[PDB]
């Protein structure tokens, strides 16, 4: 792909994070802590899952960024509406304001309702995410496999400002402690 020139510098918003996440000083890395991270509760925090939003809001234009997922067993990545539900249980779907893919139990799936099987021959270590607000497109690229397309959501109905969306995945297994990292431009 030739989307690299729409690169944007994403930083994580501490205030949206689940209370067990640890965000690095530079706001470019996030990982699951082994306990509550000693922060106050607020209405922005995701309560049920280890999720956090980027600080940036997008309402026009073309945007591209990359995330490092090396050695993780589980994660969700993409964009969401600024007004998505934060508390309680919910599915990642466009109807709920999410445009996402994920890894879970050795399979990759797109967050459609119901979910769509992805066909990945080379397990990605870094994922590229492209958003075209006007066109209604969210695309995912396999940076480890020369930028090969993973999945395109088209005819998206964003219906609001978008924020970068992250889930570090649960760590019940002891094999999913590694961070999500925003990769340099
Ligand atoms: C080993 N464990 C136990 C808790 C953590 O999972 C979570 C993460 C966020 C919210 C939540 F309610 C639970 C995990 O991966």
Tab-separated table of C-alpha atoms and ligand atoms in Angstrom:
chain	number	residue	atom	x	y	z
A	1	UNK	CA	0.000	0.000	0.000
A	2	UNK	CA	0.966	3.726	-0.384
A	3	UNK	CA	-0.849	5.081	2.792
A	4	UNK	CA	2.411	5.687	4.795
A	5	UNK	CA	2.390	9.475	3.849
A	6	UNK	CA	-0.889	9.975	5.916
A	7	UNK	CA	1.077	8.910	9.061
A	8	UNK	CA	-0.234	10.531	12.318
A	9	UNK	CA	1.499	10.550	15.756
A	10	UNK	CA	-0.933	8.750	18.107
A	11	UNK	CA	-0.715	8.993	21.926
A	12	UNK	CA	-2.780	7.087	24.505
A	13	UNK	CA	-5.332	8.865	26.766
A	14	UNK	CA	-4.670	7.693	30.423
A	15	UNK	CA	-8.125	8.923	31.506
A	16	UNK	CA	-9.916	6.372	29.231
A	17	UNK	CA	-7.779	3.396	30.328
A	18	UNK	CA	-9.057	0.428	32.330
A	19	UNK	CA	-7.664	0.913	35.876
A	20	UNK	CA	-5.296	-2.128	35.469
A	21	UNK	CA	-3.421	-0.694	32.455
A	22	UNK	CA	0.067	0.821	32.620
A	23	UNK	CA	0.699	3.477	29.969
A	24	UNK	CA	4.338	4.474	29.407
A	25	UNK	CA	5.608	8.037	30.182
A	26	UNK	CA	5.719	8.849	26.405
A	27	UNK	CA	2.058	7.647	26.088
A	28	UNK	CA	3.134	5.324	23.205
A	29	UNK	CA	2.996	1.897	24.985
A	30	UNK	CA	0.380	0.108	27.098
A	31	UNK	CA	0.391	-3.211	28.962
A	32	UNK	CA	-1.737	-5.109	31.500
A	33	UNK	CA	-0.617	-4.624	35.112
A	34	UNK	CA	-0.787	-7.490	37.658
A	35	UNK	CA	-3.141	-5.345	39.890
A	36	UNK	CA	-5.248	-2.084	40.079
A	37	UNK	CA	-2.882	0.808	39.108
A	38	UNK	CA	-3.957	3.153	41.959
A	39	UNK	CA	-6.024	5.644	39.838
A	40	UNK	CA	-9.503	7.137	40.632
A	41	UNK	CA	-12.581	5.860	38.690
A	42	UNK	CA	-14.268	8.106	36.131
A	43	UNK	CA	-17.060	7.737	33.544
A	44	UNK	CA	-14.506	7.525	30.627
A	45	UNK	CA	-12.705	4.356	31.852
A	46	UNK	CA	-13.472	1.021	30.160
A	47	UNK	CA	-14.610	-1.145	33.161
A	48	UNK	CA	-14.942	-4.729	31.854
A	49	UNK	CA	-11.992	-5.093	29.449
A	50	UNK	CA	-8.327	-3.940	29.252
A	51	UNK	CA	-9.125	-1.169	26.703
A	52	UNK	CA	-7.838	2.403	26.163
A	53	UNK	CA	-8.391	5.141	23.506
A	54	UNK	CA	-5.923	7.332	21.665
A	55	UNK	CA	-6.134	11.044	22.556
A	56	UNK	CA	-6.552	12.168	18.939
A	57	UNK	CA	-10.083	12.686	17.480
A	58	UNK	CA	-10.597	12.435	13.680
A	59	UNK	CA	-13.646	13.955	11.869
A	60	UNK	CA	-12.152	14.286	8.300
A	61	UNK	CA	-9.154	13.264	6.167
A	62	UNK	CA	-6.950	10.262	5.747
A	63	UNK	CA	-4.971	8.903	8.748
A	64	UNK	CA	-2.460	6.013	9.092
A	65	UNK	CA	-0.664	4.545	12.102
A	66	UNK	CA	1.162	1.288	13.085
A	67	UNK	CA	0.962	-0.874	16.201
A	68	UNK	CA	3.491	-3.514	17.418
A	69	UNK	CA	1.786	-6.741	18.666
A	70	UNK	CA	4.962	-8.911	19.001
A	71	UNK	CA	4.492	-12.100	21.124
A	72	UNK	CA	0.912	-11.301	22.214
A	73	UNK	CA	-1.720	-14.092	22.310
A	74	UNK	CA	-4.777	-11.793	22.316
A	75	UNK	CA	-5.599	-8.148	21.395
A	76	UNK	CA	-8.155	-5.954	19.577
A	77	UNK	CA	-7.131	-2.929	17.374
A	78	UNK	CA	-8.903	-0.382	15.246
A	79	UNK	CA	-11.010	2.809	15.659
A	80	UNK	CA	-14.238	3.622	17.453
A	81	UNK	CA	-16.758	6.437	17.875
A	82	UNK	CA	-15.827	8.889	20.642
A	83	UNK	CA	-19.234	8.052	22.267
A	84	UNK	CA	-18.902	4.231	22.551
A	85	UNK	CA	-20.186	2.621	25.767
A	86	UNK	CA	-17.437	2.380	28.487
A	87	UNK	CA	-19.226	0.371	31.258
A	88	UNK	CA	-20.473	-3.217	31.311
A	89	UNK	CA	-20.482	-5.905	28.651
A	90	UNK	CA	-20.643	-5.179	24.875
A	91	UNK	CA	-19.532	-6.709	21.527
A	92	UNK	CA	-17.086	-4.996	19.151
A	93	UNK	CA	-19.278	-4.297	16.059
A	94	UNK	CA	-20.022	-1.377	13.758
A	95	UNK	CA	-23.568	-1.254	15.250
A	96	UNK	CA	-21.886	-0.454	18.643
A	97	UNK	CA	-19.444	2.084	17.070
A	98	UNK	CA	-16.298	-0.105	16.589
A	99	UNK	CA	-14.222	-0.938	13.439
A	100	UNK	CA	-11.727	-3.518	14.696
A	101	UNK	CA	-9.815	-6.763	14.114
A	102	UNK	CA	-8.473	-9.117	16.747
A	103	UNK	CA	-6.357	-12.116	17.630
A	104	UNK	CA	-7.898	-14.761	19.914
A	105	UNK	CA	-6.976	-18.463	20.392
A	106	UNK	CA	-4.645	-18.637	17.393
A	107	UNK	CA	-7.228	-17.139	14.926
A	108	UNK	CA	-7.597	-13.609	13.501
A	109	UNK	CA	-11.126	-12.175	12.987
A	110	UNK	CA	-12.724	-8.894	11.882
A	111	UNK	CA	-15.232	-7.340	14.334
A	112	UNK	CA	-18.294	-7.595	12.058
A	113	UNK	CA	-21.590	-8.978	13.483
A	114	UNK	CA	-21.190	-11.836	13.325
A	115	UNK	CA	-17.364	-11.885	13.184
A	116	UNK	CA	-15.506	-12.645	9.916
A	117	UNK	CA	-12.568	-15.096	9.633
A	118	UNK	CA	-9.299	-13.466	8.403
A	119	UNK	CA	-6.805	-15.400	6.216
A	120	UNK	CA	-3.287	-14.590	7.498
A	121	UNK	CA	-0.354	-16.824	6.314
A	122	UNK	CA	2.351	-14.708	8.117
A	123	UNK	CA	1.406	-13.917	11.791
A	124	UNK	CA	1.858	-10.121	12.028
A	125	UNK	CA	4.301	-8.499	14.471
A	126	UNK	CA	3.090	-4.966	13.376
A	127	UNK	CA	-0.386	-3.912	12.056
A	128	UNK	CA	-0.992	-0.812	9.921
A	129	UNK	CA	-4.385	0.959	10.307
A	130	UNK	CA	-5.727	3.309	7.617
A	131	UNK	CA	-8.866	5.483	7.995
A	132	UNK	CA	-10.460	7.486	5.152
A	133	UNK	CA	-13.186	9.467	6.939
A	134	UNK	CA	-14.915	10.859	3.812
A	135	UNK	CA	-14.867	7.513	1.947
A	136	UNK	CA	-16.116	5.548	4.994
A	137	UNK	CA	-13.127	3.079	4.936
A	138	UNK	CA	-11.061	1.404	7.662
A	139	UNK	CA	-8.294	-0.916	6.376
A	140	UNK	CA	-5.745	-3.138	8.157
A	141	UNK	CA	-2.316	-4.109	6.745
A	142	UNK	CA	0.242	-6.827	7.714
A	143	UNK	CA	3.528	-4.850	8.002
A	144	UNK	CA	5.477	-8.160	8.625
A	145	UNK	CA	4.219	-9.458	5.173
A	146	UNK	CA	5.283	-6.433	2.989
A	147	UNK	CA	2.090	-4.510	3.858
A	148	UNK	CA	-0.398	-7.145	2.564
A	149	UNK	CA	-4.105	-6.339	3.092
A	150	UNK	CA	-5.764	-8.026	6.075
A	151	UNK	CA	-9.278	-6.526	5.968
A	152	UNK	CA	-11.267	-3.504	4.641
A	153	UNK	CA	-14.465	-2.222	6.289
A	154	UNK	CA	-16.240	-0.209	3.606
A	155	UNK	CA	-19.515	1.760	3.594
A	156	UNK	CA	-18.706	2.654	7.226
A	157	UNK	CA	-21.273	4.878	8.998
A	158	UNK	CA	-18.945	6.562	11.581
A	159	UNK	CA	-21.741	8.868	12.861
A	160	UNK	CA	-19.271	10.880	15.030
A	161	UNK	CA	-15.625	11.719	15.697
A	162	UNK	CA	-13.318	8.663	15.665
A	163	UNK	CA	-10.628	7.708	18.193
A	164	UNK	CA	-7.844	5.090	17.877
A	165	UNK	CA	-8.934	1.989	19.881
A	166	UNK	CA	-6.765	-0.603	21.711
A	167	UNK	CA	-7.270	-3.800	23.756
A	168	UNK	CA	-4.094	-5.457	25.227
A	169	UNK	CA	-6.096	-8.724	25.686
A	170	UNK	CA	-6.610	-10.704	28.945
A	171	UNK	CA	-3.504	-12.433	30.485
A	172	UNK	CA	-5.060	-15.481	32.275
A	173	UNK	CA	-2.458	-17.733	30.516
A	174	UNK	CA	0.689	-15.849	31.587
A	175	UNK	CA	1.542	-15.709	27.857
A	176	UNK	CA	-0.076	-12.321	27.015
A	177	UNK	CA	1.791	-9.762	29.218
A	178	UNK	CA	3.609	-8.064	26.284
A	179	UNK	CA	2.631	-4.448	25.488
A	180	UNK	CA	0.927	-2.840	22.495
A	181	UNK	CA	3.387	-0.199	21.153
A	182	UNK	CA	2.759	2.677	18.732
A	183	UNK	CA	5.627	2.336	16.157
A	184	UNK	CA	7.683	5.362	15.131
A	185	UNK	CA	7.053	7.171	11.793
B	1	LIG	C1	-5.334	-12.467	34.806
B	1	LIG	N1	-6.420	-11.504	34.722
B	1	LIG	C2	-7.379	-11.335	35.787
B	1	LIG	C3	-8.025	-9.975	35.496
B	1	LIG	C4	-7.526	-9.573	34.117
B	1	LIG	O1	-8.645	-9.343	33.238
B	1	LIG	C5	-9.399	-8.193	33.306
B	1	LIG	C6	-9.007	-7.050	32.619
B	1	LIG	C7	-9.787	-5.902	32.656
B	1	LIG	C8	-10.982	-5.885	33.344
B	1	LIG	C9	-11.360	-7.035	33.994
B	1	LIG	F1	-12.530	-7.036	34.678
B	1	LIG	C10	-10.607	-8.196	33.989
B	1	LIG	C11	-6.661	-10.743	33.669
B	1	LIG	O2	-6.237	-10.946	32.530
